[PDB]
Amino acid sequence: LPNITILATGGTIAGNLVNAVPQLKDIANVKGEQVVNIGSQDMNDNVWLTLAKKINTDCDKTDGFVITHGTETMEETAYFLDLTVKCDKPVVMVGAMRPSTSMSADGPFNLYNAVVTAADKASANRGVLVVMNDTVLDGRDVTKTNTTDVATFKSVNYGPLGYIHNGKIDYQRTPARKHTSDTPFDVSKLNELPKVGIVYNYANASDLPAKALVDAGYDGIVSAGVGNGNLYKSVFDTLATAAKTGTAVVRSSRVPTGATTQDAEVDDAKYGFVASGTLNPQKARVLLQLALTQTKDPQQIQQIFNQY
Amino acid sequence: LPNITILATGGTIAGLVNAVPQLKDIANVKGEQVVNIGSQDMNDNVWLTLAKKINTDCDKTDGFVITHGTETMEETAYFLDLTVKCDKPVVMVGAMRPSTSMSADGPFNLYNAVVTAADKASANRGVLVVMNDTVLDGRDVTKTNTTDVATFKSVNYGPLGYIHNGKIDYQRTPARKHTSDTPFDVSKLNELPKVGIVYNYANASDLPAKALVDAGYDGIVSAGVGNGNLYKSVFDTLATAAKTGTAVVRSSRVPTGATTQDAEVDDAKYGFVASGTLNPQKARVLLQLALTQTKDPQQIQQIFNQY
Amino acid sequence: LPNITILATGGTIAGNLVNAVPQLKDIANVKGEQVVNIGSQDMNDNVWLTLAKKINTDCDKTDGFVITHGTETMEETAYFLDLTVKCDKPVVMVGAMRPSTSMSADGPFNLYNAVVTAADKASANRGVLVVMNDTVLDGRDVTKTNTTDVATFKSVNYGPLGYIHNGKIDYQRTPARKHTSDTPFDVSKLNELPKVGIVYNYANASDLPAKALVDAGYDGIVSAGVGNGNLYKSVFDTLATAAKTGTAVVRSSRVPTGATTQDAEVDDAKYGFVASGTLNPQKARVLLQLALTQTKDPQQIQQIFNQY
Amino acid sequence: LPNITILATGGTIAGLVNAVPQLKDIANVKGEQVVNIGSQDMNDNVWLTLAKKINTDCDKTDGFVITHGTETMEETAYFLDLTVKCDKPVVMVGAMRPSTSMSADGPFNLYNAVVTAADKASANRGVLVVMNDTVLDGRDVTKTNTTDVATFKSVNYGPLGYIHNGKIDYQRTPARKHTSDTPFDVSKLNELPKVGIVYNYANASDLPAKALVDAGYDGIVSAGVGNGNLYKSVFDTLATAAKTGTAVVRSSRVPTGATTQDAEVDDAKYGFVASGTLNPQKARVLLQLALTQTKDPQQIQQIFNQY
């Protein structure tokens, strides 16, 4: 059987796991390590870095990775890994929307399908994956869609990669944007990422949140804008100013699906802004950080946002 | 024919009676420009004058159609939903495509909005939003896609009705209390309490929050992660704010579902309020209105459970 | 505690139930009877009738009803009950998309939420309900949306009535079309319903399926049409003929959401057809049957389709 | 500019080069009326002439746009998806609103269809359907709502791309084999095997099924309940049909999800084939094509697993 490493980041989503869900040993030789233990609402740069470094380091001593993670920021960590992992093997993330002690807990079957997915030769080369509710989803498009439903995770713009039925996966899609080993981002020698904060836009929005970050010298700000990436009067003036003094700004949107498009609502080229495409604000933050270890040029950051 | 007043807040979404002549077959239309701005610039002032206007001219017309940008449409709708005291239908409409583009959506949207406003059956269902052949309630409606003509949906509870050929099949009506059943009256107000929103994500900074607490904001709404949870730093900052008078609502960046009470965070211990299904921008509207009435978290929660 | 009767129609969706899901006895006094035992793909007129007659007969000796049922035809039985039950008390239907022995089986929590719903004073007067995946759905709009997902049941046109969190229900909607005790349909003295069959429309469709039913003297045919209730050349000619000789025909659609509207695509008044509104074909069959015990007039059957 | 041929199958969805002049900014357009019918009347003949035409004129143009009714659009798309042998893009488009209604959708749909057909990037993605700013693959696309302009979606796997300002962001491409990678060639055919569809519901009659078996149909597709299950009577009838040569595919009336193999029904024991995610109308298309190749259920299943 294939050797699969389980990397745990928080509490257990089932019930070692192998004793709590004994069916696991019919599809794989499982072994687990606790790399950290926190609720995902506390996820941060440190954890990301040690996760990536680990996966890259232990890549050759296993056939696949399953990463146990809270649902709250799952979509964030998934995209980060999608851009920094250099392992050929499958890296699959999984979680549970119900506590492992509640009746009809979802963790056990999710964990099982995650291992099934990691052990499938066909899962290789599709980038970092998230398996939930019988579905294989790519790290880039997947997002949390409902606060409590077991079926909350969906790839809202472009759809899932596959569905699992009885331990078999029917793959009918694979991501087109470049990921993992095709990206130029390498964090193996990094101890911190650039600082990137997110501001929200709504009626009568205050410019203070933005000004606080510009004053603390943040490397980039991501704007959760209204509609197709638009911004409130005040927030606009503040960010426009930031940009011409070296702060990098990405226009994203609080609207949950669709792309924030280039030069449509805002003259990006005139102000030096970057449009995030379909990346929502939290995902746009992950990319902007990674771009910033590479360049400060908005014209180039845009190219990056068009390729990954 | 019914008299319908069109209140314009921005540019024209069509081309009105001359641009879409079919209008005078269902109503006697008249329009005024109350303000002219893009909705991404919508603000407290505008809201107040809109409400005062509707309440004041309520008796000289049978229904209102409000032309508005889609960007903050869902915000204004909820505000009106809570402050209008007119029995008559108040309908909001917009367009996702410029009126000059081919296949522009404004004309038929405007048409169906007037149809909706002139329908006797539309009365008493609170402020409505009509887009893409659908009648949606001001509370649940939200922008779902950045560019799709079909972007507006009532994501948690669904639409009130569908329009086909100028007839509306109503199969639902809002249960939360709205318009004339709320205790909020802004007719004598010139400003609303100050309420800001902060976002949560991995490694989130506490600075945005601290900026608002330092400027003495009356309330902060937190766009949390998952079921209204917060990042370490933002938590500590908001928890402190709350015990010094600042009101804090836990909402969520997750587009559908309720942020529930005392599940993820001990709301009672810290004095927080959970927003239910109100997304952050909508939660800001209600917190503002609540704050003109009370500063008690235990009561603000009650308000969040009723409206 | 409230007394709740569980009426079982097939296999058990959990594991008496009270021993398999012991939490039940904290919210209700439960008692169960097996009225029949079949897979729901075999549901039929007989079963419907005995279900309705039972609920109506035992109405006064309990506070609420939970009906255990297969998912396959759930939406059919739910609507039938929605139109024939005369009990004031709550009638809630529930099922499971996963076998009760599979890991992460959904039956137990569904059953629990169904009992919670039935015992809630607020559930009364909202018509027959279906509780699945933490959601309260009305019998009329609810349909099966996916072949295997635990979250398959949704009220696709008008939305759910409420969501359950921790045994509390937040109701924010109630159905407007008349149901249960406001309908004129009474089956308490019936031993059979009129015969109503369904035909499908697609490219190059054959007229044989329709002609078979007209020749066997069916009381009504429901057409699963294409688009907004349209029909294929051949099927059209055959049904148009049927209608002017006394067969009642409803135009519905195979498209899963939206209304099949009146006189839009087909001149209903000229041919004597009835449009189903938002009722999908299987649901339109249930109503047509019930209307037929009352009238053969198409003009009137249409009124019925506009009221229930 | 690229030369694009528009093949019309019904009425005009716009008003073409004169009705939507912007067209001549992106392509040299030319059109022919190959047939003229409402798509609810689409049939085998039309399909065959469409395919033969595209294959025959493939070299005298850079791309095809096919104008077609929305009712059976999803059926024709899949058929072409399996029988076209042209490298060039073949795009289908329609309109949910009559070209004379205000806010008619045909013009911009047509525009984006031509844009799509002229894009070098659209090549090799199989037959496409362009509606409401979206590029969808012929296999997964289906009609989702009876009247909404946004009705077409690829409900199981999602769209291939979104169009904004005449640029397409492609992020997906179909994995199942299509067009020139399939073994189906109808260039020498004058008729397809006969395949009918039956529906399942409570108390379903077996007559519809029996009518087709008695008329010697080559195959029957069953729109089953749930995961492809069948009613008592329909089951017994189809099971019998299968062991006498009739081919039977279990599909489902449930609009999304796969009907899976050997889960609910023992397909191997009765000789049935499960359709996977193909809905009944789409399952009919593939069964027809398979039947021109084989009558073996074990092999028809393989076909259903590959295309």
Where are chain C's structural domains?
1-194, 195-307
SS3 of B59, please?
helix
Domain range D194-306, CATH class: alpha beta
DSSP A145-175: -BSS-TT-EEETTT--SEEEETTEEEE----
- The type of residue at D141 is V
This structure's resolution (Å) is 2.7
| Termini Cα distance of chain C | 34
For residues B15 and B99, the answer to whether their CB atoms sit within 8 Å is yes
Residue C263 — left, alpha, or beta (φ > 0 → left; ψ -120 to 50 → alpha)?
left
- CA A271 remoteness from chain centre: 28
Q: Where are the alpha helices (DSSP H) in chain C?
A: 17-20, 45-58, 74-84, 107-118, 208-215, 233-243, 268-271, 281-292, 298-307
Structural domain C1-194, CATH architecture? 3-Layer(aba) Sandwich (3.40)
What are the two backbone dihedrals, phi and then psi, of residue D169, each rounded to the nearest 5 degrees?
-100, 95
Instruction: State the Cα–Cα distance between residues D127 and D86, nearest whole angstrom.
Output: 10
Tokens coding A170: 């029917």
Task: Choose the mutation target among B43, B71, B221, B231 for the interface with A, i.e. most A CBs under 10 Å.
Answer: B71
Active-site residue, from D12, D61, D144, D292: D12
SS3 of A20, please?
helix
Instruction: State the Cα–Cα distance between residues C220 and A33, nearest whole angstrom.
Output: 65
Active-site residue, from B9, B12, B72, B277: B12
List of chain D residues whose C-beta atoms are within 8 Å of the C-beta of residue C255: 143-146, 151
What are the two backbone dihedrals, phi and then psi, of residue D101, each rounded to the nearest 5 degrees?
-75, 155
| Residue that the structure tokens 């739910």 belong to | C78
Nearest CB to A104; choose among C108, C148, C165: C108
Whether residues D103 and B101 touch (CB distance < 8 A) is answered with no
Whether residues D230 and C257 touch (CB distance < 8 A) is answered with no
- The type of residue at B48 is L
Task: Choose the mutation target among A134, A166, A172 for the interface with D, i.e. most D CBs under 10 Å.
Answer: A172
Active-site residue, from C9, C12, C68, C293: C12
Is C12 labeled as catalytic in the residue annotation?
Answer: yes
Domains D1-193 and D194-306 alike in fold: yes
Instruction: State the Cα–Cα distance between residues D181 and D306, nearest whole angstrom.
Output: 11
Rounded to a whole number, what is the distance in Å from the CA of A255 to chain B's nearest CA? 6
Nearest CB to B103; choose among D107, D148, D150: D107
- CA A169 remoteness from chain centre: 22
Say yes or no: domain A195-307 is CATH 3.40.50.40. yes
Nearest CB to C104; choose among A106, A148, A165: A106
Tokens coding C9: 């129609």
Strands of chain C (E only): list them.
Answer: 3-8, 29-34, 64-68, 91-94, 129-132, 135-138, 142-144, 153-155, 162-165, 168-171, 196-200, 220-225, 248-253, 273-275
SS3 of B208, please?
helix
Whether residues D281 and C146 touch (CB distance < 8 A) is answered with no
Strands A142-144 and A153-155: antiparallel
Strands of chain B (E only): list them.
Answer: 3-8, 28-33, 63-67, 90-93, 128-131, 134-137, 141-143, 152-154, 161-164, 167-170, 195-199, 219-224, 247-252, 272-274
Structural domain D1-193, CATH architecture? 3-Layer(aba) Sandwich (3.40)
Contacting chains of B (3 CB pairs or more, <8 Å) are A, C, D
For residues B114 and B76, the answer to whether their CB atoms sit within 8 Å is no
Rounded to a whole number, what is the distance in Å from the CA of C21 to chain A's nearest CA? 9
Name the residue in chain B with its Cα closest to that of D151.
Answer: B150
b/e string for A67-90 if b means 16 or more Cβ within 10 A? bbbbbbbbbbbbbbbbbbbbbebb
- Number of Cβ within 10 Å of residue D234's Cβ equals 26
Instruction: State the Cα–Cα distance between residues A240 and D159, nearest whole angstrom.
Output: 35
Tokens coding D144: 């989702």
- CA A47 remoteness from chain centre: 13
Q: Where are the alpha helices (DSSP H) in A244-307?
A: 268-271, 281-292, 298-307
Whether residues D103 and B102 touch (CB distance < 8 A) is answered with no
Which helix H or strand E contains D90, and what residues bound it? strand D90-93
Rounded to a whole number, what is the distance in Å from the CA of C97 to chain D's nearest CA? 10
Tokens coding B175: 């249960």
DSSP state of A277: B
List of chain B residues whose C-beta atoms are within 8 Å of the C-beta of residue A263: none
Whether residues B107 and D106 touch (CB distance < 8 A) is answered with no
Give CA angle at B221 (B217, B222), nearest 5°: 125
Which helix H or strand E contains B281, and what residues bound it? helix B280-291
Instruction: State the Cα–Cα distance between residues C264 and C245, nearest whole angstrom.
Output: 24
List of chain A residues whose C-beta atoms are within 8 Å of the C-beta of residue B231: 41-42
Instruction: State the Cα–Cα distance between residues D139 and D275, nearest whole angstrom.
Output: 13
Strands C220-225 and C196-200: parallel
What are the two backbone dihedrals, phi and then psi, of residue B280, each rounded to the nearest 5 degrees?
-60, -45
Active-site residue, from A12, A62, A145, A261: A12
Q: Where are the alpha helices (DSSP H) in A31-90?
A: 45-58, 74-84
Positive or negative, the CA dihedral B14, B15, B16, B22 is negative
User: What is the side-by-side strand order in the sheet with B3-8?
Assistant: B28-33, B3-8, B63-67, B90-93, B128-131, B134-137, B161-164, B167-170
Whether residues A171 and D175 touch (CB distance < 8 A) is answered with yes
Tokens coding B191: 């400003």
SS3 of D269, please?
helix
Nearest CB to C109; choose among A103, A108, A110: A103
